[PDB]
Design a protein around this ligand. Structure first.
Ligand code: CLA
Ligand code: CLA
Ligand code: CLA
Ligand code: CLA
Ligand code: CLA
Ligand code: CLA
Ligand code: CLA
Ligand code: CLA
Ligand code: XAT
Ligand code: LUT
Ligand code: SF4
Ligand code: SF4
Lengths: 162, 41, 101, 64, 80, 211, 197
């Protein structure tokens, strides 16, 4: 009940929308036999809709004036209340993104220490790429240990015109 | 055989190995686990 | 409250302040600043009658570095710094400016 | 004799060249008193497509 | 017309004189390169500005430069 | 130095050098840098040293709790039962813990950067006794059993510490999928060894085969 | 001349070598330049002297029992007769404001025109009537005592501000509270000094 919003568990617009979708899906049930493939498909879609509304609700998710769930993003404001899960868990993307970056940077540096590193880019060295992909699980430790040693950057060896 | 396995390292290793793996992983995650809007905390 | 004693006791305090304790500091502080000329160009032979600093003697008349226009310049403190205190009519007009809290 | 050792990697110091602050291998150094006798060769091509250029003696520095 | 200039960083490969389609540049003898010849441009009034000489220049940076300027009947490539 | 974690085809690069409990296990090659290796061994020593005290504080009390000697709560609710007593301070334990712990943690930190950097003009009169022998291995702290000649006692220390770390991770995971204690989950494993298993008792892996 | 190490086995800064009250504390390397270090020195001395006088008066009014230090300037807003040790001075708020502006203006104007690097930190003559500056050794340890007491007084003034910012109890009362329940009443129990306590 922050930023003027209300929990999805006590909102009339949320229930109104839920019944609307359950009704528009149920209107298509009369056009088919009670035991065929379109009937089974429509029944599976109805079960998924009921489960999603139940899953979206009772999990601290709150909506505002229209039944649509809103998301709290300020840390602290999302930590003082049970709203950390909605967007404060940015560390999942940061982990996968840093994993991709560390694997690519390790492949660029290692491949450059070879005669003509070009054809190694158009024709990947798959045993070296697979070995470097499964070796970068602890990428933040390698990043902090490669920064203190100064092996992450260059001093002044850049094609500049400044 | 060496020429075929080295041919398989140009464009398929990046456009059909990773693409098929990543697409299949995200699709199977969204298939067994239905639609995820929060960390379910 | 009294306007005569709030802007009068103001003028003299701002004047005596600027003439007894802030005069050598102002003179020592204005030495690093240069005049209006664009790094000193020719003026008299080019008809620059407005940029040239006004003459009117501009020499020592008092003691320990005097002020001809400074006595009228620094004197604006009389109305800049105390006409505000002199006009403090909100202390009896109901509009409280104490800012509680 | 006046230029650097043939086959030694050097650094270019011409501020308007495509290989500024880069490292290039010296292929040959002329001994005729010309303005730019140190000829170098670089691994990476320029915008035009060439990969070699000749610099003077003052715009050639040793690598790092 | 356009102003063409030839700098001293020329190597005398004679490629700009071969690439010029209006006979503007020429090769004069010089004593500052291995080929002992440097380019020149006496027929500057016939420069059209297609910049083929700059593409034919192999040194970095280009020894020949075509600075465009005022246009005349010859430099505008008009045939009427 | 000690037996390899695998029987073969796994030769490390920076693990050839002698070290305490050297088993040659480093697949991600994290300790390649010498300074980072020297810092990671201290981190492992501190983590194992505190995990040992934590696992004994949980397991040793759980033995008497399951037998019936004491009536103390389990570890997952020992915190929820200490503060409801009438004579127990508010949540100031975290602050006094942070202050009093940071005071000695900074001494141990400045000792790693500059080994033996405890000058005479720092403490009152024990300013000379804090000169440790090696990094992570001090002398004036411990009083007996340490003036021997052969160091492989540290191997027992490191092996007990590694087993303790793995044990605490098992404590936090077993009590997260079953809601019981470690010996409470161990005693039930002795009764039915095929029924209470992580593959089928707790919701660990999605096994849905109920034909 | 290092009066103590702020951290055992710290990094010796080669800038704070021959200075009184030196502890080689500064880790942000502020004042590394030899010119700004003098301005920082005189600023520290002036702030130490002002904070010592402030903390002394702040604790003196409460130990003598004449009212809270924060509640002392509330006389102009509430509208009554202010007093100093029960004398009831008849000065208005505009009059004390004016005399304070003029007196501090002439005092600070005369202080700023010293132009003496030694006399700007430690003057003497008229500012030292007792003259305990003859003995150079006594002058040295007295200067060190001045800096050590001044820094403690600055931390004490910031403490009075924080104590009144969290709770509304007076200074001595704040001590009494800590003496009534040390493990139950401290800064970690106000609910505001730590976002989460
Ligand atoms: C050496 C430590 C150790 C020991 C003795 C045990 C013992 C036990 N665990 Mg446990 N566990 C451990 C570590 C350990 N675990 C760790 C580190 C984790 C986190 C991944 C878990 C997570 C876990 C879960 C989620 C569950 C158990 C469960 C159980 C009980 C049934 C066995 C089972 O289902 O498979 C055990 C599952 C494992 C992941 C352990 C296998 C791999 C470990 C880490 C290898 C270590 C073994 C060691 C090399 C040899 C044994 C040493 C011993 C003789 C001292 C059993 C008494 C289940 C239970 O409580 O039954 C109701 C259960 O649900 N464990
Ligand atoms: C630039 C990004 C950003 C922005 C715009 C905000 C904005 C805000 N934060 Mg915040 N915060 C941030 C990043 C940010 N935060 C980060 C990175 C962290 C660390 C994870 C925090 C941790 C944090 C905490 C712990 C708290 C806030 C709080 C607040 C709110 C009140 C701020 C305040 O000082 O109280 C009022 C100012 C009066 C002058 C405010 C809307 C407070 C809050 O959530 O409100 C209940 C709160 O206590 N934040
Ligand atoms: C793994 C290689 C790699 C790495 C480590 C980086 C890293 C970086 N890039 Mg970059 N980039 C890459 C590839 C890479 N890039 C490629 C292939 C392109 C062409 C599409 C670009 C185009 C690009 C632009 C236009 C910009 C950056 C910028 C940046 C910086 C900002 C962070 C960012 O994420 O920007 C965004 C990065 C992207 C949008 C590229 C995403 C595409 C994927 C991740 C690249 C695929 C890499 C491949 C899988 C690696 C092979 C693995 C190997 C085992 C075979 C950062 C240092 C920004 C900058 O200027 O610096 C501040 C910037 O403006 N990049
Ligand atoms: C059906 C015919 C066909 C098609 C559609 C393509 C299509 C493509 N080729 Mg291929 N090629 C073909 C035949 C074909 N080729 C044949 C017969 C040969 C000789 C064996 C080659 C040899 C060849 C080489 C050597 C290369 C390509 C490359 C490429 C890609 C262009 C580069 C790019 O996207 O930017 C670049 C993109 C980035 C810098 C960002 C990196 C992230 C990317 C987007 C992820 C990769 C996913 C992939 C491109 C998308 C799916 C691929 C698709 C075929 C399913 C492109 C998708 C280039 C390539 O491998 O792509 C990188 C390249 O190096 N081709
Ligand atoms: C490469 C990413 C990826 C991943 C991680 C998975 C994972 C999975 N797939 Mg799958 N699949 C993928 C790509 C992927 N798929 C692609 C690209 C296709 C199109 C060719 C398929 C088409 C496919 C079909 C048709 C089926 C699966 C099924 C399955 C599940 C059981 C298989 C198994 O037990 O293996 C090991 C499990 C490891 C966790 C499993 C979780 C089966 C399934 O539906 O499960 C009932 C199933 O029948 N997949
Ligand atoms: C924070 C705990 C911790 C730390 C800091 C270390 C640190 C170290 N261990 Mg170690 N180890 C640990 C726990 C830890 N270990 C546990 C619990 C076990 C029992 C399974 C072992 C078993 C073990 C063996 C058998 C060996 C080591 C070895 C080493 C050293 C090799 C270098 C290295 O791997 O870098 C440091 C490693 C880390 C900092 C790990 C980072 C944490 C990751 C990112 C999270 C992992 C999550 C996990 C999978 C769940 C190193 C100093 C080798 C050695 O002794 O060298 C002589 C050796 O052969 N360890
Ligand atoms: C007006 C405050 C002030 C000033 C100007 C100085 C100035 C100086 N101090 Mg000093 N110090 C102060 C306060 C101050 N101090 C206080 C309160 C303490 C007690 C904690 C100390 C304890 C101390 C020690 C132990 C030592 C010094 C020393 C020094 C000298 C060298 C350090 C330096 O170059 O930094 C220059 C100073 C500044 C640039 C002032 C800038 C202030 C910035 C903006 C930080 C302020 C923000 C701060 C975090 C606020 C806290 C509030 C909190 C709620 C966030 C220098 C002349 C060293 C010395 O040799 O003595 C001569 C020395 O060893 N100081
Ligand atoms: C530079 C430090 C300093 C400052 C700024 C103040 C400031 C103040 N003191 Mg104070 N005081 C100080 C040092 C200081 N004191 C010291 C060192 C002592 C111990 C001798 C005292 C003992 C003291 C007493 C006993 C009282 C104050 C009071 C006051 C307040 C009213 C003063 C007044 O009426 O005019 C000055 C009066 C005359 C010049 C006559 C005022 C805010 C008075 C007060 O308001 O109590 C709440 C009060 O009774 N002070
Ligand atoms: C001026 C001062 C106090 C003066 C108090 C006065 C006049 C009080 C007067 C009155 O109270 C009375 C008597 C009566 C009241 O009724 C009215 C008032 C008027 C209220 C305190 C300064 C106090 C100043 C303080 C607290 C300074 C803090 C310094 C810190 C924290 C150190 C920081 C650094 O360490 C870093 C972080 C990095 C390092 O590199 C460098 C350094 C700079 C050394
Ligand atoms: C100059 C001269 C020279 C000549 O010749 C001679 C003559 C000698 C006489 C002189 C003078 C001198 C002087 C003036 C001195 C002074 C000092 C002061 C003022 C103060 C202190 C002052 C003061 C100070 C330090 C203070 C400190 C304080 C503190 C810590 C406090 C604390 C506290 C607190 C927090 C709170 C609680 O609740 C309480 C307590 C616990 C209690
Ligand atoms: S721009 Fe064209 S016409 Fe002019 S000199 Fe170059 S090649 Fe010749
Ligand atoms: S193309 Fe360039 S280098 Fe060659 S002759 Fe012409 S100007 Fe000289």
């Amino acid at each position: 009940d922050i930023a003027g919003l209300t929990p999805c568990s006590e909102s009339k617009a949320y229930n109104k929308l839920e019944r609307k979708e359950l009704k528009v899906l149920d209107k298509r049930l009369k056009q088919y036999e009670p035991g065929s493939a379109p009937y089974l498909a429509l029944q599976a879609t109805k079960e998924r809709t009921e489960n999603r509304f139940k899953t979206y609700a009772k999990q601290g998710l709150l909506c505002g004036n229209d039944g649509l769930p809103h998301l709290i993003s300020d840390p602290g404001l999302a930590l003082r209340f049970n709203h950390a899960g909605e967007v404060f868990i940015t560390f999942g993307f940061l982990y996968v993104a840093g994993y991709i970056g560390h694997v690519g940077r390790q492949y660029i540096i290692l491949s450059k220490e070879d005669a003509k590193p070009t054809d190694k880019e158009i024709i990947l060295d798959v045993p070296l790429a697979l070995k470097l992909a499964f070796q970068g699980w602890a990428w933040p430790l390698a990043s902090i240990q490669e920064l203190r040693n100064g092996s992450l950057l260059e001093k002044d060896e850049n094609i500049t015109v400044s | 055989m060496k020429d075929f396995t080295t041919y398989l390292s140009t464009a398929p290793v990046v456009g059909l190995g990773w693409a098929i793996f990543t697409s299949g992983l995200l699709i199977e995650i969204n298939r067994f686990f239905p639609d995820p809007l929060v960390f379910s905390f | 409250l009294e306007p005569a004693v709030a802007i009068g006791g103001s003028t003299v305090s701002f004047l005596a302040l600027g003439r007894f304790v802030f005069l050598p500091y102002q003179r020592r502080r204005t030495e690093m600043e240069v005049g209006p000329g664009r790094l000193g160009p020719k003026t008299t032979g080019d008809t620059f009658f407005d940029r040239l600093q006004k003459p009117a003697s501009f020499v020592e008349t008092k003691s320990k570095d005097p002020s001809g226009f400074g006595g009228w310049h620094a004197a604006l403190g009389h109305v800049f710094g105390y006409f505000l205190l002199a006009c403090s009519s909100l202390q009896d007009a109901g509009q409280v400016i104490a800012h509680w809290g | 004799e006046i230029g650097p050792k043939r086959g030694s990697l050097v650094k270019v110091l011409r501020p308007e060249s495509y290989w500024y602050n880069q490292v290039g291998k010296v292929v040959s150094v002329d001994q005729s008193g010309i303005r730019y006798p140190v000829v170098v060769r670089f691994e990476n091509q320029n915008y035009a497509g060439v990969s070699t250029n000749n610099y003077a003696l003052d715009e050639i520095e040793e690598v790092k | 017309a356009h102003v063409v200039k030839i700098y001293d960083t020329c190597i005398g490969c004679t490629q700009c004189v071969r690439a010029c389609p209006l006979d503007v540049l020429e090769m004069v003898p010089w004593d500052g390169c291995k080929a002992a010849q440097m380019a020149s441009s006496p027929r500057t009034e016939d420069c059209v500005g297609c910049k083929r000489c700059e593409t034919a220049c192999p040194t970095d940076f280009l020894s020949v430069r075509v600075y465009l300027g005022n246009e005349s009947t010859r430099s505008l490539g008009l045939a009427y | 130095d000690r037996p390899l974690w695998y029987p073969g085809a796994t030769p490390p690069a920076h693990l050839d050098g002698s070290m305490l409990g050297d088993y040659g296990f480093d697949p991600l090659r994290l300790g390649t840098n010498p300074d980072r290796m020297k810092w990671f061994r201290e981190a492992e020593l501190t983590n194992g040293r505190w995990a040992m005290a934590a696992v004994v504080g949980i397991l040793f009390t759980d033995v008497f709790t399951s037998i019936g000697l004491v009536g103390l709560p389990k570890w997952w609710e020992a915190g929820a039962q200490t503060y409801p007593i009438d004579n127990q301070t508010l949540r100031t334990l975290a602050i006094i813990e942070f202050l009093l712990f940071g005071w000695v943690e900074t001494k141990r930190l400045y000792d790693l950067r500059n080994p033996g950097s405890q000058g005479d003009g720092s403490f009152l009169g024990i300013t000379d006794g804090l000169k440790g022998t090696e990094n992570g291995y001090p002398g004036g702290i411990f009083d007996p059993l340490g003036y021997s000649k052969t160091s492989p006692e540290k191997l027992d220390e490191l092996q007990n510490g590694r087993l303790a770390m793995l044990a605490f991770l098992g404590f936090a995971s077993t009590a997260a999928v079953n809601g019981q204690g470690p010996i409470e989950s161990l005693q039930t494993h002795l009764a039915d060894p095929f029924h209470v298993t992580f593959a089928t008792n707790g919701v660990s892996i999605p096994h849905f085969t109920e034909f | 001349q290092r009066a103590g190490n702020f951290a055992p086995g710290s990094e010796p800064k080669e800038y704070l070598n021959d200075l009184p009250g030196n502890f080689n504390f500064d880790p942000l390397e502020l004042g590394k330049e030899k010119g700004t270090l003098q301005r920082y020195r005189e600023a520290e001395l002036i702030h130490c002297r002002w904070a010592m006088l402030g903390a002394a008066g702040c604790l003196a009014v409460e130990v003598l029992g004449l009212g809270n230090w924060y509640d002392a300037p509330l006389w102009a807003v509430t509208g009554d007769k202010p007093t100093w040790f029960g004398i009831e001075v008849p000065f208005d708020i505009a009059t004390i404001l004016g005399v304070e502006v003029v007196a501090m203006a002439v005092a600070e104007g005369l202080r700023n025109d010293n132009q003496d690097m030694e006399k700007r930190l430690y003057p003497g003559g008229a500012f030292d009537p007792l003259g305990f500056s003859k003995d150079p050794k006594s002058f040295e340890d007295k200067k060190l005592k001045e800096l050590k007491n001044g820094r403690l007084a600055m931390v004490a003034c910031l403490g009075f501000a924080g104590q009144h910012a969290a709770t509304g109890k007076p200074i001595l009362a704040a001590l009494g509270d800590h003496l009534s329940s040390p493990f139950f009443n401290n800064f970690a129990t106000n609910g505001v000094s730590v976002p989460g306590v």
